[PDB]
Amino acid sequence: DTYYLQVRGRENFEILMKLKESLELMELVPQPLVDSYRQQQQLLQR
């Protein structure tokens, strides 16, 4: 279920933390918003 990742460099660490945060948080978003968002993307890039 849970994984451990090691990184060298503070700047790299902080960067990965921001992405870890966004990735973990989006699981608290109701699926129809997620799906709505992906529908929208289809007009925004190929």
Per CB under 8 A, residues contacting a second copy are 1-10, 12-13, 15-29, 33-34, 37-38, 41, 44-46
Measuring CA to CA, how many Å separate 41 from each of 20, 27, 45? 22, 18, 6
Least gap, CB of 21 to a second copy (angstroms): 7
Q: How far is the CB of 26 from a second copy (least distance, A)?
A: 4
Closest contact distance (angstroms) between CB of 41 and a second copy is 7
CA distances from 19 to 16, 42, 43, 46 (A): 5, 23, 24, 23
